[PDB]
Amino acid sequence: VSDAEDKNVNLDVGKELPEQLKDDEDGKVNPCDEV
């Protein structure tokens, strides 16, 4: 039951953004390089 620090509140949802969404899907392969 802590007091909130309501006086001046500044949120940053980008910091909480899951690491999954910070980049694209990583499955990509150049078949010509691997074979």
Partner: protein, 49 residues
């Protein structure tokens, strides 16, 4: 009536003009995806006292 009536040859072209390509080679890749599910738990129901 015994006679030779026809024949077949084993002749072939030379592809000095690259008329034929035959088979073609192209690279491919397949991807499989296996996400891991959760499973039902096992619980130990102790008393709270």
């Amino acid at each position: 009536d015994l006679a030779v009536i026809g024949f077949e040859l084993d002749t072939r072209f030379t592809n000095t003009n690259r008329r034929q390509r035959g088979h073609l080679l192209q690279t491919r890749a397949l991807q499989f995806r296996h996400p891991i599910p959760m499973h039902a738990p096992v619980t130990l129901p102790m008393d709270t006292m």
